[PDB]
Short mmCIF file of C-alpha atoms in Angstrom, two decimals:
data_model
loop_
_atom_site.label_atom_id
_atom_site.label_comp_id
_atom_site.label_asym_id
_atom_site.label_seq_id
_atom_site.Cartn_x
_atom_site.Cartn_y
_atom_site.Cartn_z
CA UNK K 1 2.79 -7.24 12.55
CA UNK K 2 2.34 -6.96 8.83
CA UNK K 3 4.93 -7.42 6.07
CA UNK K 4 8.15 -5.65 6.97
CA UNK K 5 10.40 -4.37 4.26
CA UNK K 6 13.94 -2.96 4.92
CA UNK K 7 14.49 -1.02 1.77
CA UNK K 8 15.28 2.36 3.42
CA UNK K 9 17.64 3.27 6.15
CA UNK K 10 16.13 3.82 9.75
CA UNK K 11 16.22 7.61 9.94
CA UNK K 12 13.90 8.10 13.02
CA UNK K 13 16.64 7.78 15.64
CA UNK K 14 16.47 10.56 18.38
CA UNK K 15 19.03 12.50 16.32
CA UNK K 16 19.68 12.75 12.53
CA UNK K 17 23.39 13.00 13.33
CA UNK K 18 26.29 15.19 12.92
CA UNK K 19 27.19 17.41 9.95
CA UNK K 20 30.82 18.29 10.17
CA UNK K 21 31.85 21.20 7.79
CA UNK K 22 35.46 21.67 7.17
CA UNK K 23 35.86 25.10 5.46
CA UNK K 24 39.35 25.84 4.33
CA UNK K 25 39.58 29.42 2.90
CA UNK K 26 43.02 30.57 3.81
CA UNK K 27 46.08 28.51 3.32
CA UNK K 28 49.55 29.04 4.78
CA UNK K 29 51.71 31.33 2.77
CA UNK K 30 54.50 28.73 2.69
CA UNK K 31 52.13 26.57 0.50
CA UNK K 32 51.38 29.38 -1.87
CA UNK K 33 47.89 28.03 -2.25
CA UNK K 34 45.38 30.69 -3.16
CA UNK K 35 42.53 31.75 -0.76
CA UNK K 36 39.20 30.06 -1.84
CA UNK K 37 36.98 33.19 -2.36
CA UNK K 38 33.29 32.35 -1.88
CA UNK K 39 33.75 29.37 0.28
CA UNK K 40 32.14 31.07 3.25
CA UNK K 41 29.03 31.41 1.13
CA UNK K 42 29.10 27.60 0.73
CA UNK K 43 29.77 27.00 4.36
CA UNK K 44 26.79 29.15 5.48
CA UNK K 45 24.40 27.72 2.90
CA UNK K 46 25.36 24.23 4.02
CA UNK K 47 24.97 25.08 7.64
CA UNK K 48 21.45 26.46 7.12
CA UNK K 49 20.51 23.71 4.72
CA UNK K 50 21.48 20.87 7.05
CA UNK K 51 20.11 22.73 10.12
CA UNK K 52 16.63 22.61 8.52
CA UNK K 53 17.28 18.80 8.05
CA UNK K 54 17.78 18.61 11.79
CA UNK K 55 21.50 17.76 11.72
CA UNK K 56 23.82 18.84 14.45
CA UNK K 57 26.10 21.22 12.37
CA UNK K 58 29.67 21.85 13.43
CA UNK K 59 31.84 24.10 11.36
CA UNK K 60 35.57 24.24 11.39
CA UNK K 61 37.58 26.85 9.62
CA UNK K 62 41.12 26.74 8.12
CA UNK K 63 42.30 23.37 9.56
CA UNK K 64 45.81 22.02 9.08
CA UNK K 65 46.25 18.51 7.81
CA UNK K 66 46.95 17.43 11.42
CA UNK K 67 43.77 19.12 12.75
CA UNK K 68 41.65 17.55 10.04
CA UNK K 69 42.90 14.13 11.10
CA UNK K 70 42.49 14.82 14.72
CA UNK K 71 39.02 16.21 14.19
CA UNK K 72 37.81 13.18 12.22
CA UNK K 73 39.40 10.70 14.68
CA UNK K 74 37.66 12.45 17.66
CA UNK K 75 34.35 12.56 15.85
CA UNK K 76 34.58 8.86 14.94
CA UNK K 77 35.37 8.16 18.62
CA UNK K 78 31.96 9.72 19.77
CA UNK K 79 28.97 7.58 20.58
CA UNK K 80 26.62 7.80 17.60
CA UNK K 81 24.22 5.33 18.96
CA UNK K 82 21.32 7.67 19.09
CA UNK K 83 22.18 9.16 15.67
CA UNK K 84 20.67 8.04 12.36
CA UNK K 85 23.54 9.02 10.13
CA UNK K 86 26.78 11.01 9.69
CA UNK K 87 27.61 13.78 7.29
CA UNK K 88 30.96 15.41 6.55
CA UNK K 89 31.39 18.15 4.05
CA UNK K 90 34.86 19.09 2.86
CA UNK K 91 35.52 22.50 1.20
CA UNK K 92 39.06 22.90 0.01
CA UNK K 93 41.58 22.57 -2.76
CA UNK K 94 42.32 19.10 -3.80
CA UNK K 95 43.48 16.46 -6.34
CA UNK K 96 42.27 12.95 -6.92
CA UNK K 97 41.82 11.14 -3.66
CA UNK K 98 43.23 14.17 -1.70
CA UNK K 99 41.81 17.04 0.18
CA UNK K 100 44.15 19.93 1.35
CA UNK K 101 44.68 21.17 4.94
CA UNK K 102 46.02 24.66 5.24
CA UNK K 103 49.53 23.33 5.42
CA UNK K 104 49.46 20.23 3.37
CA UNK K 105 47.42 17.11 1.91
CA UNK K 106 45.27 14.61 3.66
CA UNK K 107 44.37 11.35 1.85
CA UNK K 108 40.59 11.14 1.77
CA UNK K 109 40.97 7.45 2.58
CA UNK K 110 42.71 8.49 5.93
CA UNK K 111 39.66 10.56 6.82
CA UNK K 112 37.00 8.03 5.72
CA UNK K 113 38.74 4.98 7.34
CA UNK K 114 37.91 6.28 10.78
CA UNK K 115 34.30 5.64 9.97
CA UNK K 116 34.64 2.10 8.58
CA UNK K 117 32.03 -0.32 9.72
CA UNK K 118 34.55 -2.14 11.96
CA UNK K 119 36.11 1.11 13.38
CA UNK K 120 33.08 3.08 14.35
CA UNK K 121 30.64 0.54 15.78
CA UNK K 122 27.89 3.07 16.60
CA UNK K 123 27.65 4.01 12.83
CA UNK K 124 27.70 0.44 11.47
CA UNK K 125 24.74 -0.09 9.28
CA UNK K 126 24.13 3.75 9.17
CA UNK K 127 24.72 5.92 6.05
CA UNK K 128 27.93 7.83 6.23
CA UNK K 129 27.90 10.74 3.72
CA UNK K 130 30.94 12.55 2.50
CA UNK K 131 30.29 15.59 0.38
CA UNK K 132 33.46 16.94 -1.41
CA UNK K 133 34.04 20.25 -3.07
CA UNK K 134 37.57 20.13 -4.48
CA UNK K 135 39.41 19.39 -7.69
CA UNK K 136 40.12 15.79 -8.54
CA UNK K 137 42.71 16.61 -11.17
CA UNK K 138 43.35 19.17 -13.85
CA UNK K 139 41.26 17.94 -16.77
CA UNK K 140 38.99 20.48 -18.54
CA UNK K 141 35.54 19.61 -19.81
CA UNK K 142 34.90 21.74 -22.89
CA UNK K 143 31.35 20.41 -23.14
CA UNK K 144 29.23 19.99 -26.23
CA UNK K 145 26.40 22.15 -27.65
CA UNK K 146 22.88 20.68 -27.34
CA UNK L 1 35.94 31.89 -12.02
CA UNK L 2 38.24 30.24 -9.49
CA UNK L 3 39.10 26.59 -9.35
CA UNK L 4 45.03 23.98 -10.15
CA UNK M 1 21.14 -24.93 -4.16
CA UNK M 2 24.15 -24.45 -1.88
CA UNK M 3 27.42 -22.76 -1.95
CA UNK M 4 30.63 -22.08 0.00
CA UNK M 5 30.19 -18.25 -0.37
CA UNK M 6 26.67 -17.81 0.74
CA UNK M 7 24.18 -18.23 3.62
CA UNK M 8 26.79 -17.59 6.32
CA UNK M 9 26.02 -18.68 9.91
CA UNK M 10 27.48 -15.37 11.21
CA UNK M 11 26.33 -12.39 9.12
CA UNK M 12 28.76 -9.62 8.36
CA UNK M 13 28.80 -6.65 6.09
CA UNK M 14 31.63 -5.05 4.24
CA UNK M 15 33.60 -2.50 6.30
CA UNK M 16 33.33 -0.18 3.20
CA UNK M 17 29.54 -0.57 3.08
CA UNK M 18 27.05 2.33 3.72
CA UNK M 19 29.36 5.14 2.49
CA UNK M 20 28.12 7.77 -0.03
CA UNK M 21 30.62 10.16 -1.66
CA UNK M 22 29.03 13.13 -3.33
CA UNK M 23 31.86 14.56 -5.46
CA UNK M 24 31.50 17.95 -6.95
CA UNK M 25 33.16 16.81 -10.17
CA UNK M 26 34.09 13.79 -12.30
CA UNK M 27 37.35 11.80 -11.62
CA UNK M 28 40.39 13.79 -12.80
CA UNK M 29 38.55 16.99 -13.46
CA UNK M 30 38.72 20.62 -12.14
CA UNK M 31 35.97 21.76 -9.88
CA UNK M 32 34.72 25.38 -10.38
CA UNK M 33 33.91 27.96 -7.80
CA UNK M 34 32.36 31.49 -8.20
CA UNK M 35 34.35 33.89 -6.05
CA UNK M 36 31.13 35.53 -5.12
CA UNK M 37 28.30 33.07 -5.24
CA UNK M 38 30.20 29.96 -4.09
CA UNK M 39 30.95 26.69 -5.72
CA UNK M 40 28.66 25.50 -8.48
CA UNK M 41 28.25 22.14 -6.78
CA UNK M 42 27.43 23.39 -3.20
CA UNK M 43 25.11 26.08 -4.53
CA UNK M 44 23.21 23.43 -6.46
CA UNK M 45 23.29 20.77 -3.63
CA UNK M 46 21.76 23.07 -1.10
CA UNK M 47 19.13 24.31 -3.57
CA UNK M 48 18.00 20.79 -4.40
CA UNK M 49 18.01 19.70 -0.75
CA UNK M 50 16.01 22.70 0.27
CA UNK M 51 13.44 21.95 -2.50
CA UNK M 52 13.38 18.09 -2.45
CA UNK M 53 14.63 16.66 0.94
CA UNK M 54 11.08 16.31 2.09
CA UNK M 55 10.03 14.63 -1.26
CA UNK M 56 12.69 12.55 -2.88
CA UNK M 57 15.12 9.79 -2.13
CA UNK M 58 18.66 10.99 -1.77
CA UNK M 59 20.01 9.54 -4.99
CA UNK M 60 17.28 11.27 -6.93
CA UNK M 61 18.05 14.53 -5.21
CA UNK M 62 21.75 14.20 -6.10
CA UNK M 63 20.66 13.33 -9.75
CA UNK M 64 18.85 16.71 -9.82
CA UNK M 65 22.06 18.31 -8.61
CA UNK M 66 23.99 16.63 -11.43
CA UNK M 67 21.57 18.01 -14.00
CA UNK M 68 21.60 21.47 -12.51
CA UNK M 69 25.41 21.86 -12.46
CA UNK M 70 25.67 20.23 -15.84
CA UNK M 71 23.16 22.47 -17.63
CA UNK M 72 23.16 25.79 -15.82
CA UNK M 73 26.86 26.54 -15.21
CA UNK M 74 29.71 27.38 -17.58
CA UNK M 75 32.97 29.11 -16.69
CA UNK M 76 33.97 32.61 -17.82
CA UNK M 77 37.62 33.54 -17.73
CA UNK M 78 39.91 35.98 -19.30
CA UNK M 79 42.22 33.10 -19.78
CA UNK M 80 41.13 31.03 -22.78
CA UNK M 81 42.37 27.90 -21.13
CA UNK M 82 39.77 28.15 -18.25
CA UNK M 83 37.05 29.83 -20.28
CA UNK M 84 33.74 28.24 -21.37
CA UNK M 85 34.29 24.98 -19.28
CA UNK M 86 31.64 22.67 -17.91
CA UNK M 87 31.31 20.44 -14.81
CA UNK M 88 29.41 17.26 -13.98
CA UNK M 89 29.21 16.08 -10.35
CA UNK M 90 30.00 12.45 -9.55
CA UNK M 91 27.72 10.43 -7.20
CA UNK M 92 29.67 7.49 -5.69
CA UNK M 93 27.33 5.06 -3.71
CA UNK M 94 28.26 2.16 -1.64
CA UNK M 95 24.95 2.54 0.26
CA UNK M 96 22.77 -0.58 0.84
CA UNK M 97 19.38 1.04 1.27
CA UNK M 98 17.37 4.01 0.10
CA UNK M 99 17.90 7.23 2.00
CA UNK M 100 15.12 9.73 2.91
CA UNK M 101 15.87 12.51 5.32
CA UNK M 102 12.21 12.50 6.45
CA UNK M 103 10.15 9.69 8.06
CA UNK Z 1 20.49 38.13 -10.03
CA UNK Z 2 23.09 37.76 -12.74
CA UNK Z 3 26.49 36.04 -13.21
CA UNK Z 4 29.26 35.34 -15.62
CA UNK Z 5 28.86 31.57 -15.23
CA UNK Z 6 25.16 31.06 -15.78
CA UNK Z 7 22.26 31.52 -18.23
CA UNK Z 8 24.48 30.80 -21.28
CA UNK Z 9 23.12 31.89 -24.65
CA UNK Z 10 24.30 28.69 -26.19
CA UNK Z 11 23.50 25.69 -24.01
CA UNK Z 12 26.13 22.92 -23.68
CA UNK Z 13 26.42 19.88 -21.35
CA UNK Z 14 29.61 18.36 -20.05
CA UNK Z 15 31.21 15.76 -22.30
CA UNK Z 16 31.40 13.47 -19.20
CA UNK Z 17 27.66 13.84 -18.54
CA UNK Z 18 25.30 10.98 -18.80
CA UNK Z 19 27.62 8.10 -17.96
CA UNK Z 20 26.88 5.50 -15.17
CA UNK Z 21 29.54 3.16 -14.10
CA UNK Z 22 28.34 0.19 -12.06
CA UNK Z 23 31.44 -1.25 -10.47
CA UNK Z 24 31.45 -4.65 -8.95
CA UNK Z 25 33.53 -3.57 -6.08
CA UNK Z 26 34.88 -0.54 -4.05
CA UNK Z 27 37.86 1.45 -5.38
CA UNK Z 28 41.08 -0.47 -4.65
CA UNK Z 29 39.42 -3.82 -3.72
CA UNK Z 30 39.33 -7.31 -5.01
CA UNK Z 31 36.21 -8.48 -6.88
CA UNK Z 32 35.13 -12.00 -6.08
CA UNK Z 33 33.90 -14.62 -8.54
CA UNK Z 34 32.56 -18.07 -7.83
CA UNK Z 35 34.09 -20.51 -10.36
CA UNK Z 36 30.77 -22.33 -10.72
CA UNK Z 37 28.01 -19.75 -10.13
CA UNK Z 38 29.66 -16.74 -11.66
CA UNK Z 39 30.73 -13.53 -10.04
CA UNK Z 40 28.85 -12.17 -6.99
CA UNK Z 41 28.15 -8.86 -8.66
CA UNK Z 42 26.79 -10.11 -12.07
CA UNK Z 43 24.71 -12.86 -10.28
CA UNK Z 44 23.14 -10.15 -8.08
CA UNK Z 45 22.70 -7.48 -10.84
CA UNK Z 46 20.85 -9.91 -13.10
CA UNK Z 47 18.62 -11.05 -10.25
CA UNK Z 48 17.63 -7.60 -9.34
CA UNK Z 49 17.14 -6.52 -12.91
CA UNK Z 50 14.86 -9.48 -13.49
CA UNK Z 51 12.87 -8.69 -10.41
CA UNK Z 52 12.79 -4.89 -10.42
CA UNK Z 53 13.45 -3.46 -13.94
CA UNK Z 54 9.75 -3.09 -14.54
CA UNK Z 55 9.22 -1.50 -11.06
CA UNK Z 56 12.17 0.64 -9.92
CA UNK Z 57 14.41 3.43 -11.06
CA UNK Z 58 17.89 2.18 -12.05
CA UNK Z 59 19.72 3.78 -8.98
CA UNK Z 60 17.26 1.98 -6.71
CA UNK Z 61 17.81 -1.33 -8.42
CA UNK Z 62 21.55 -0.98 -8.11
CA UNK Z 63 21.09 -0.14 -4.44
CA UNK Z 64 19.33 -3.43 -4.01
CA UNK Z 65 22.28 -5.10 -5.72
CA UNK Z 66 24.70 -3.41 -3.35
CA UNK Z 67 22.69 -4.89 -0.41
CA UNK Z 68 22.56 -8.33 -1.86
CA UNK Z 69 26.24 -8.57 -2.55
CA UNK Z 70 27.09 -6.97 0.84
CA UNK Z 71 24.89 -9.21 2.92
CA UNK Z 72 24.48 -12.59 1.13
CA UNK Z 73 28.13 -13.23 0.05
CA UNK Z 74 31.40 -14.08 1.85
CA UNK Z 75 34.50 -15.74 0.40
CA UNK Z 76 35.62 -19.28 1.30
CA UNK Z 77 39.27 -20.17 0.69
CA UNK Z 78 41.78 -22.74 1.82
CA UNK Z 79 44.14 -19.75 1.95
CA UNK Z 80 43.53 -17.75 5.09
CA UNK Z 81 44.49 -14.58 3.25
CA UNK Z 82 41.50 -14.79 0.77
CA UNK Z 83 39.07 -16.46 3.28
CA UNK Z 84 36.04 -14.91 4.92
CA UNK Z 85 36.14 -11.77 2.82
CA UNK Z 86 33.47 -9.32 1.80
CA UNK Z 87 32.47 -7.11 -1.06
CA UNK Z 88 30.44 -3.96 -1.66
CA UNK Z 89 29.64 -2.86 -5.22
CA UNK Z 90 30.26 0.82 -6.18
CA UNK Z 91 27.72 2.88 -8.06
CA UNK Z 92 29.25 5.78 -9.87
CA UNK Z 93 26.71 8.13 -11.42
CA UNK Z 94 27.22 11.16 -13.71
CA UNK Z 95 23.61 10.76 -14.95
CA UNK Z 96 21.46 13.82 -15.17
CA UNK Z 97 18.04 12.14 -15.07
CA UNK Z 98 16.30 9.16 -13.58
CA UNK Z 99 16.45 6.02 -15.58
CA UNK Z 100 13.59 3.59 -16.08
CA UNK Z 101 13.83 0.59 -18.46
CA UNK Z 102 10.11 0.75 -18.98
CA UNK Z 103 7.83 3.56 -20.22
CA UNK E 1 -0.28 20.37 -23.42
CA UNK E 2 0.03 20.05 -19.71
CA UNK E 3 2.99 20.56 -17.41
CA UNK E 4 5.98 18.86 -18.81
CA UNK E 5 8.69 17.61 -16.44
CA UNK E 6 11.93 16.15 -17.77
CA UNK E 7 13.12 14.21 -14.72
CA UNK E 8 13.54 10.85 -16.44
CA UNK E 9 15.47 9.88 -19.65
CA UNK E 10 13.47 9.40 -22.81
CA UNK E 11 13.41 5.56 -23.05
CA UNK E 12 10.72 5.10 -25.72
CA UNK E 13 12.95 5.38 -28.86
CA UNK E 14 12.40 2.66 -31.43
CA UNK E 15 15.27 0.69 -29.85
CA UNK E 16 16.44 0.43 -26.19
CA UNK E 17 19.99 0.29 -27.56
CA UNK E 18 23.04 -2.02 -27.74
CA UNK E 19 24.28 -4.21 -24.92
CA UNK E 20 27.93 -5.07 -25.59
CA UNK E 21 29.26 -7.82 -23.53
CA UNK E 22 32.98 -8.37 -23.49
CA UNK E 23 33.63 -11.82 -22.00
CA UNK E 24 37.28 -12.54 -21.42
CA UNK E 25 37.77 -16.04 -19.97
CA UNK E 26 40.92 -17.26 -21.47
CA UNK E 27 44.15 -15.22 -21.44
CA UNK E 28 47.35 -15.72 -23.51
CA UNK E 29 49.82 -18.00 -21.87
CA UNK E 30 52.42 -15.40 -22.27
CA UNK E 31 50.61 -13.29 -19.77
CA UNK E 32 50.18 -16.05 -17.20
CA UNK E 33 46.81 -14.65 -16.30
CA UNK E 34 44.43 -17.35 -15.07
CA UNK E 35 41.21 -18.44 -16.83
CA UNK E 36 38.17 -16.79 -15.31
CA UNK E 37 36.07 -19.84 -14.48
CA UNK E 38 32.32 -19.10 -14.25
CA UNK E 39 32.48 -16.11 -16.42
CA UNK E 40 30.46 -17.75 -19.12
CA UNK E 41 27.65 -18.08 -16.53
CA UNK E 42 27.76 -14.40 -16.11
CA UNK E 43 27.79 -13.80 -19.81
CA UNK E 44 24.87 -15.98 -20.45
CA UNK E 45 22.86 -14.51 -17.44
CA UNK E 46 23.59 -10.93 -18.81
CA UNK E 47 22.50 -11.83 -22.32
CA UNK E 48 19.20 -13.20 -21.20
CA UNK E 49 18.61 -10.42 -18.64
CA UNK E 50 19.12 -7.68 -21.14
CA UNK E 51 17.42 -9.57 -23.86
CA UNK E 52 14.33 -9.37 -21.74
CA UNK E 53 14.83 -5.59 -21.35
CA UNK E 54 14.82 -5.47 -25.13
CA UNK E 55 18.47 -4.53 -25.70
CA UNK E 56 20.29 -5.62 -28.82
CA UNK E 57 22.85 -7.94 -27.11
CA UNK E 58 26.20 -8.56 -28.86
CA UNK E 59 28.65 -10.84 -26.99
CA UNK E 60 32.40 -10.91 -27.69
CA UNK E 61 34.69 -13.54 -26.16
CA UNK E 62 38.47 -13.38 -25.43
CA UNK E 63 39.29 -10.12 -27.00
CA UNK E 64 42.82 -8.70 -27.20
CA UNK E 65 43.55 -5.19 -25.96
CA UNK E 66 43.58 -4.17 -29.66
CA UNK E 67 40.22 -5.94 -30.38
CA UNK E 68 38.61 -4.14 -27.43
CA UNK E 69 39.67 -0.80 -28.57
CA UNK E 70 38.63 -1.39 -32.19
CA UNK E 71 35.23 -2.86 -31.11
CA UNK E 72 34.46 0.25 -28.95
CA UNK E 73 35.62 2.56 -31.62
CA UNK E 74 33.50 0.90 -34.24
CA UNK E 75 30.39 0.75 -31.95
CA UNK E 76 30.77 4.37 -31.01
CA UNK E 77 30.88 5.13 -34.75
CA UNK E 78 27.46 3.65 -35.37
CA UNK E 79 24.29 5.68 -35.76
CA UNK E 80 22.51 5.42 -32.40
CA UNK E 81 19.90 7.97 -33.34
CA UNK E 82 16.94 5.51 -32.93
CA UNK E 83 18.43 4.13 -29.69
CA UNK E 84 17.47 5.16 -26.19
CA UNK E 85 20.69 4.19 -24.48
CA UNK E 86 23.97 2.30 -24.59
CA UNK E 87 25.20 -0.56 -22.34
CA UNK E 88 28.69 -2.08 -22.16
CA UNK E 89 29.53 -4.89 -19.77
CA UNK E 90 33.08 -5.76 -19.15
CA UNK E 91 33.99 -9.18 -17.63
CA UNK E 92 37.70 -9.70 -17.02
CA UNK E 93 40.66 -9.27 -14.70
CA UNK E 94 41.60 -5.73 -13.89
CA UNK E 95 43.12 -3.09 -11.56
CA UNK E 96 42.03 0.35 -10.63
CA UNK E 97 40.97 2.02 -13.95
CA UNK E 98 42.12 -0.84 -15.97
CA UNK E 99 40.40 -3.78 -17.76
CA UNK E 100 42.40 -6.65 -19.28
CA UNK E 101 42.41 -7.74 -22.76
CA UNK E 102 43.65 -11.34 -23.35
CA UNK E 103 47.15 -9.95 -24.17
CA UNK E 104 47.37 -6.80 -22.11
CA UNK E 105 45.70 -3.90 -20.32
CA UNK E 106 43.17 -1.31 -21.63
CA UNK E 107 42.57 1.99 -19.79
CA UNK E 108 38.89 2.29 -18.97
CA UNK E 109 39.13 5.90 -19.97
CA UNK E 110 40.23 4.90 -23.46
CA UNK E 111 37.12 2.80 -23.86
CA UNK E 112 34.68 5.32 -22.33
CA UNK E 113 36.10 8.33 -24.21
CA UNK E 114 34.79 7.03 -27.50
CA UNK E 115 31.32 7.68 -26.06
CA UNK E 116 31.87 11.14 -24.89
CA UNK E 117 29.06 13.67 -25.46
CA UNK E 118 31.27 15.34 -28.13
CA UNK E 119 32.61 12.18 -29.71
CA UNK E 120 29.35 10.26 -30.12
CA UNK E 121 26.76 12.71 -31.14
CA UNK E 122 23.99 10.11 -31.55
CA UNK E 123 24.25 9.26 -27.91
CA UNK E 124 24.59 12.83 -26.51
CA UNK E 125 21.91 13.26 -23.86
CA UNK E 126 21.35 9.58 -23.57
CA UNK E 127 22.42 7.30 -20.65
CA UNK E 128 25.73 5.40 -21.23
CA UNK E 129 26.03 2.54 -18.91
CA UNK E 130 29.32 0.70 -18.16
CA UNK E 131 29.02 -2.38 -15.91
CA UNK E 132 32.41 -3.58 -14.73
CA UNK E 133 33.23 -7.02 -13.16
CA UNK E 134 36.94 -6.78 -12.44
CA UNK E 135 39.38 -6.11 -9.49
CA UNK E 136 40.11 -2.40 -8.80
CA UNK E 137 43.11 -3.29 -6.66
CA UNK E 138 44.18 -5.82 -4.20
CA UNK E 139 42.63 -4.63 -0.94
CA UNK E 140 40.71 -7.16 1.12
CA UNK E 141 37.51 -6.36 3.10
CA UNK E 142 37.32 -8.45 6.26
CA UNK E 143 33.91 -7.21 7.04
CA UNK E 144 32.33 -6.65 10.47
CA UNK E 145 29.77 -8.85 12.28
CA UNK E 146 26.24 -7.48 12.53
CA UNK I 1 36.69 -18.59 -4.69
CA UNK I 2 38.46 -16.91 -7.63
CA UNK I 3 39.35 -13.19 -7.90
CA UNK I 4 45.20 -10.57 -8.03
#
């Protein structure tokens, strides 16, 4: 055939892929973490948005740190051969490099490692997208007038 | 506004 | 030319390759959320995806998200400490190719 | 609609906005350099800028750099610990617009 | 005039801007840090590359942590009104969030803060690019066969 | 190869 350039990911597999949405709104009283009002609006908006992009959306609400890890592990263990990509959206409280389960923290690295090129072979060479809505610290940007 |  | 670190017989890619992290905020900063309309970042991300997913490459879509959040949002709080604050999303790409949701 | 965090009378932008950090490697990882040809990242960055600066948007140029480093380079060392290693650059963008070096 | 879209940075100012190259090859014996062989090749390649992009290239070799800070402070104090952008390339040893001077570390945040939108008004709204060639830790990527 |  003619000149072949591979500058863009192959996105015409039978499936676009999974879009896992972890929506943590209510936290265990024991942690004292405040409920994240308005997060349901985000979760719904994301579900519809990615649905229209043809992703297989799976929403999970109020997951403990253990459930977040088990979910990611199980998902990384699936056969993504016929899927073009992978998307995971995390909605919760957080700090730099950390996302909060309803009962404690989860290192983002712990979550993303399951999808490493050598640990999830059916996603090797495919885009793995992690969308994170959470604090990355306590610094405040006062901005500047334009 | 919510965010700590 | 020739070297010890190139033209490998067996091709491999980094295990960290092909990851894209779309952070709602810059490293070390707060991330704002409206208790009624949702987070500034997700609100903006969905809006830009809905309007540009069938037109622009992903990084360019996320750049529009950066601009939307940076220019259109500012916090309001009865607490001076958290009032009049801004936010800039942070795109972290380890992708190796352009990404279009359409084909 | 109307809200307390939008449509500000006085427009401001985040002080962290409009920054782009082109890291040679992923967070927490080593960055490799050939004692004779230079670092893998800079070698690749210059090559892609020379070939695409008058053709592609900056993020797309950096994406080519990511691919070049990720696929074409692998370390060689007499020390097994540092032998056969890979590298993936890390693009961190807080930019709010597309960037073309030409006009 | 016709429809005006502002999707790309204005890059037609009289000057493209500065390209500051900090090339640290030799470190003080007291630190024991090894010389970075091959960095001169990088510095030269960058100088020529950005020269062709019409940037005002300024190279600095073997700067102490104090000189790196003074250089950045002075540069941020210049009038960039007629410049479209700013570029800084750091070539040295490093760790996560840190770049090494010839006699010690310099927090990257310290360097970049000088250029914040509220601290360098002549660059507000303009792209500020920091190219960093340095370790960000000691993790090793063993890769995966394709 | 140089890099620690």
